[PDB]
Design an enzyme around this catalytic site. Structure first.
Site, PDB file in Angstrom:
ATOM      1  N   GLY A   1      26.154  52.163  47.135  1.00  0.00           N
ATOM      2  CA  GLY A   1      26.967  50.983  46.875  1.00  0.00           C
ATOM      3  C   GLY A   1      26.066  49.776  46.719  1.00  0.00           C
ATOM      4  N   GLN A   2      26.675  48.605  46.533  1.00  0.00           N
ATOM      5  CA  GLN A   2      25.934  47.357  46.372  1.00  0.00           C
ATOM      6  C   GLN A   2      25.170  46.953  47.635  1.00  0.00           C
ATOM      7  OE1 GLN A   2      25.359  45.600  43.545  1.00  0.00           O
ATOM      8  NE2 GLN A   2      26.541  47.139  42.408  1.00  0.00           N
TER       9      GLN A   2
ATOM     10  N   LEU B   1      37.050  60.793  52.884  1.00  0.00           N
ATOM     11  CA  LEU B   1      36.157  61.366  51.885  1.00  0.00           C
ATOM     12  C   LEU B   1      36.982  61.867  50.714  1.00  0.00           C
ATOM     13  CD1 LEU B   1      33.047  62.150  51.411  1.00  0.00           C
ATOM     14  CD2 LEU B   1      33.695  64.444  52.203  1.00  0.00           C
TER      15      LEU B   1
ATOM     16  N   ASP C   1      38.410  45.471  38.839  1.00  0.00           N
ATOM     17  CA  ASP C   1      37.350  46.422  38.500  1.00  0.00           C
ATOM     18  C   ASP C   1      37.893  47.827  38.209  1.00  0.00           C
ATOM     19  OD1 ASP C   1      33.867  46.683  39.784  1.00  0.00           O
ATOM     20  OD2 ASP C   1      34.754  47.064  37.824  1.00  0.00           O
TER      21      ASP C   1
ATOM     22  N   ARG D   1      34.728  54.810  36.622  1.00  0.00           N
ATOM     23  CA  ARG D   1      33.586  54.816  37.551  1.00  0.00           C
ATOM     24  C   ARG D   1      34.025  54.555  38.994  1.00  0.00           C
ATOM     25  NH1 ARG D   1      32.830  49.575  34.757  1.00  0.00           N
ATOM     26  NH2 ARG D   1      33.265  47.956  36.314  1.00  0.00           N
ATOM     27  N   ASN D   2      35.174  53.907  39.164  1.00  0.00           N
ATOM     28  CA  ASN D   2      35.688  53.542  40.479  1.00  0.00           C
ATOM     29  C   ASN D   2      36.894  54.378  40.879  1.00  0.00           C
ATOM     30  OD1 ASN D   2      33.838  51.414  41.141  1.00  0.00           O
ATOM     31  ND2 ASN D   2      34.935  50.083  39.711  1.00  0.00           N
TER      32      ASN D   2
ATOM     33  N   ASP E   1      36.916  51.151  45.349  1.00  0.00           N
ATOM     34  CA  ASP E   1      36.195  49.909  45.047  1.00  0.00           C
ATOM     35  C   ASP E   1      37.066  48.654  45.128  1.00  0.00           C
ATOM     36  OD1 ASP E   1      34.414  47.901  44.234  1.00  0.00           O
ATOM     37  OD2 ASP E   1      33.510  49.141  42.681  1.00  0.00           O
TER      38      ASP E   1
HETATM   39  N1  LIG Z   1      35.606  57.416  49.817  1.00  0.00           N
HETATM   40  C1  LIG Z   1      34.589  57.894  49.117  1.00  0.00           C
HETATM   41  N2  LIG Z   1      34.454  59.215  48.921  1.00  0.00           N
HETATM   42  C2  LIG Z   1      33.440  59.703  48.225  1.00  0.00           C
HETATM   43  N3  LIG Z   1      32.516  58.913  47.692  1.00  0.00           N
HETATM   44  C3  LIG Z   1      32.602  57.579  47.838  1.00  0.00           C
HETATM   45  C4  LIG Z   1      33.645  57.037  48.568  1.00  0.00           C
HETATM   46  N4  LIG Z   1      33.495  55.720  48.569  1.00  0.00           N
HETATM   47  C5  LIG Z   1      32.393  55.441  47.867  1.00  0.00           C
HETATM   48  N5  LIG Z   1      31.847  56.569  47.419  1.00  0.00           N
HETATM   49  C6  LIG Z   1      30.591  56.689  46.606  1.00  0.00           C
HETATM   50  O1  LIG Z   1      29.843  55.423  46.539  1.00  0.00           O
HETATM   51  C7  LIG Z   1      29.806  54.985  45.156  1.00  0.00           C
HETATM   52  C8  LIG Z   1      30.017  53.482  45.160  1.00  0.00           C
HETATM   53  O2  LIG Z   1      31.312  53.166  45.639  1.00  0.00           O
HETATM   54  P1  LIG Z   1      31.971  51.761  45.340  1.00  0.00           P
HETATM   55  O3  LIG Z   1      33.184  51.513  46.156  1.00  0.00           O
HETATM   56  O4  LIG Z   1      32.279  51.651  43.773  1.00  0.00           O
HETATM   57  O5  LIG Z   1      30.759  50.755  45.756  1.00  0.00           O
HETATM   58  P2  LIG Z   1      30.373  49.332  45.151  1.00  0.00           P
HETATM   59  O6  LIG Z   1      29.480  48.652  46.128  1.00  0.00           O
HETATM   60  O7  LIG Z   1      31.704  48.459  44.984  1.00  0.00           O
HETATM   61  N6  LIG Z   1      29.688  49.646  43.678  1.00  0.00           N
HETATM   62  P3  LIG Z   1      30.199  48.931  42.274  1.00  0.00           P
HETATM   63  O8  LIG Z   1      31.085  50.011  41.447  1.00  0.00           O
HETATM   64  O9  LIG Z   1      29.015  48.542  41.476  1.00  0.00           O
HETATM   65  O10 LIG Z   1      31.126  47.648  42.504  1.00  0.00           O
HETATM   66  C9  LIG Z   1      30.972  55.705  44.489  1.00  0.00           C
HETATM   67  O11 LIG Z   1      30.710  55.851  43.095  1.00  0.00           O
HETATM   68  C10 LIG Z   1      30.938  57.066  45.169  1.00  0.00           C
HETATM   69  O12 LIG Z   1      29.878  57.860  44.645  1.00  0.00           O
HETATM   70 MG   LIG Z   2      32.495  46.879  43.462  1.00  0.00          MG
END
Ligand SMILES: Nc1ncnc2c1ncn2[C@@H]1O[C@H](COP(=O)(O)OP(=O)(O)NP(=O)(O)O)[C@@H](O)[C@H]1O
Ligand SMILES: [Mg+2]
Length: 276
Positions: free
Chosen positions: A21-22, A91, A136, A140-141, A154
């Site tokens: 993540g970020q 998960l 968003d 991808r999300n 996300d």
């Molecule tokens: N509940 C979950 N189960 C499985 N994988 C997860 C889960 N949450 C997050 N991930 C993994 O972490 C990655 C990033 O999650 P995300 O919530 O999109 O983070 P972010 O910090 O907001 N990244 P961004 O899409 O750039 O805004 C996802 O693409 C998954 O690979």
């Molecule tokens: Mg995000």
């Protein structure tokens, strides 16, 4: 009563890294009990959780997620607020939608694709009724719980509208190709601009995790859209579904269907596909 989200680290077993993540690595793991136990979880970690400012921004997703309870929105399990700071969620074991579609292509048919789109429309009509704007929406999300079940995640960019008009803007490399024109032009974000993004998301799903406007420049795309150009009908997409997508891409946000409407039409298109 009163739901307490603070979890104890002893109840968590940290497993392997499953993404980034970020704020840091995301891990899979296990959340335990003496009773009602062995639950697989995702654990978001935070690189610099000693800084109040970084910690605040990170825990905000969790704050936003304690408001939601929906089968197709990723569930918050809890947080550990002592350092190292963790966010615990359900998960989604099959992972990211894009990867899933690209790989499971020959094991999925058209009805499964419309189902995923339908499931996401229920999560978004839910947010729409709570006056919540996601901002968003993109494949991808979207995460995969099982073969017949996707979930929106996300909630880093997600904001509660006092229903009053727009949201503002802060910082970040904007996903221009998913964005409604009024979001690009005015930094204006509403349920209607969410609908625009959902249309692009539906296109992606139907293209099996291929990205919109590939090879096209972020600044050429704005002009293409104004001049009336739209993403083409995906191979073996039903005319009724593409018609639905094009309505999502109405330049005027007032002409776009609400999510509650999209939910009902997708439900009908799904039955017709399974029937015929
Ligand atoms: N509940 C979950 N189960 C499985 N994988 C997860 C889960 N949450 C997050 N991930 C993994 O972490 C990655 C990033 O999650 P995300 O919530 O999109 O983070 P972010 O910090 O907001 N990244 P961004 O899409 O750039 O805004 C996802 O693409 C998954 O690979
Ligand atoms: Mg995000």
């Amino acid at each position: 009563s009163t739901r307490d989200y603070e979890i104890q680290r002893e109840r968590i077993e940290l497993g392997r890294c499953i993404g980034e993540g970020q704020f840091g690595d995301v891990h899979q793991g296990i959340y335990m009990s003496p009773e009602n136990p062995a639950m697989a979880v995702a654990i978001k970690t935070c690189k610099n959780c000693t800084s109040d400012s970084v910690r605040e921004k990170f825990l905000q997703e969790a704050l936003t997620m304690r408001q939601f309870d929906h089968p197709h929105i990723v569930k918050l399990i809890g947080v550990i607020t002592e350092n190292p700071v963790w966010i615990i969620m359900e998960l989604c074991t099959l992972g990211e939608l894009r990867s899933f579609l690209q790989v499971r292509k020959f094991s999925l048919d058209l009805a499964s694709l419309i189902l995923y789109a339908y499931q996401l429309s229920t999560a978004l009509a839910y947010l729409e009724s709570k006056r919540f704007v996601h901002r968003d929406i993109a494949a991808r999300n979207v995460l995969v719980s099982s073969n017949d079940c996707v979930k929106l995640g996300d909630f880093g960019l997600s904001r509660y509208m006092e229903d009053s008009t727009y949201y503002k803007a802060s910082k970040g490399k904007l996903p221009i190709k998913w964005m409604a024109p009024e979001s690009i032009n005015f930094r204006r974000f509403t349920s209607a601009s969410d609908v625009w993004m959902f249309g692009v998301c539906m296109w992606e799903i139907l293209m099996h995790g291929v990205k919109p406007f590939q090879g096209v420049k972020n600044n050429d795309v704005i002009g293409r859209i104004e001049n009336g150009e739209r993403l083409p009908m995906p191979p073996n997409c039903p005319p009724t579904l593409y018609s639905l997508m094009t309505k999502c891409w109405a330049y005027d946000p007032s002409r776009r269907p609400r999510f509650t409407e999209l939910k009902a039409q997708l439900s009908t298109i799904l039955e017709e596909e399974k029937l015929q």
